[PDB]
């Protein structure tokens, strides 16, 4: 688990974040589909998409962004509860695994992205202090998520 240092680190950052949520969970996603074309095969509205300026103004994306800064948000904000985190991120994983059938590598993939996306929004907030903590999140994250596709067998 965090500390409550690591713990405070993520959720000050996220704070900044989640300011403008809308515009960095498309702006994570359109760099996530642009630079991982083999990602979008799972959704139907944009799966043959290219143009960046569309896949920014497409609603089934902008959709997704607002579920995925959600469900993040969700996380952050009850990391002092470790139950709710896993509750959260089980239902995830397991969602993820059996009803969109996405490997779960994509999950380490969309992290990167996000780690770069926050690095460059926010590098004079990110000091190694925050991007450890973030790393551990990061962590506790794909875990979670990886746990979740074995238990269905996946
Ligand atoms: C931090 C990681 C992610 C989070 C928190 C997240 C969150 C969510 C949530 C809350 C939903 C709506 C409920 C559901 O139908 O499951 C959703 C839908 C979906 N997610 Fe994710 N997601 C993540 C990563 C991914 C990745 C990496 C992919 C595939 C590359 C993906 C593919 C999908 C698809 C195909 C849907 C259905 C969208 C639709 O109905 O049009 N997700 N996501």
Known sequence: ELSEAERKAVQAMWA???????????????????????????????????????????????????????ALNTVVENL???????????????????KHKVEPVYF????????????????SDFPPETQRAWAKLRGLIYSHVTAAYKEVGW
């Open 16 to 70: 900044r974040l989640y300011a403008n949520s809308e515009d960095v969970g498309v702006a994570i996603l359109v760099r996530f589909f642009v630079n991982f074309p083999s990602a979008k095969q799972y959704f139907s509205q944009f799966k043959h998409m290219e143009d960046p300026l569309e896949m920014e103004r497409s609603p089934q994306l902008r959709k997704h962004a607002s579920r995925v800064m959600g």
């Open 108 to 123: 380490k993939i969309l992290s990167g992205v996000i780690l770069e996306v926050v690095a460059e929004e926010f590098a």
């Open 80 to 98: 002092h509860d470790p139950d709710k985190v896993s509750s959260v991120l089980a239902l995830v994983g397991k969602a993820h695994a059996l």
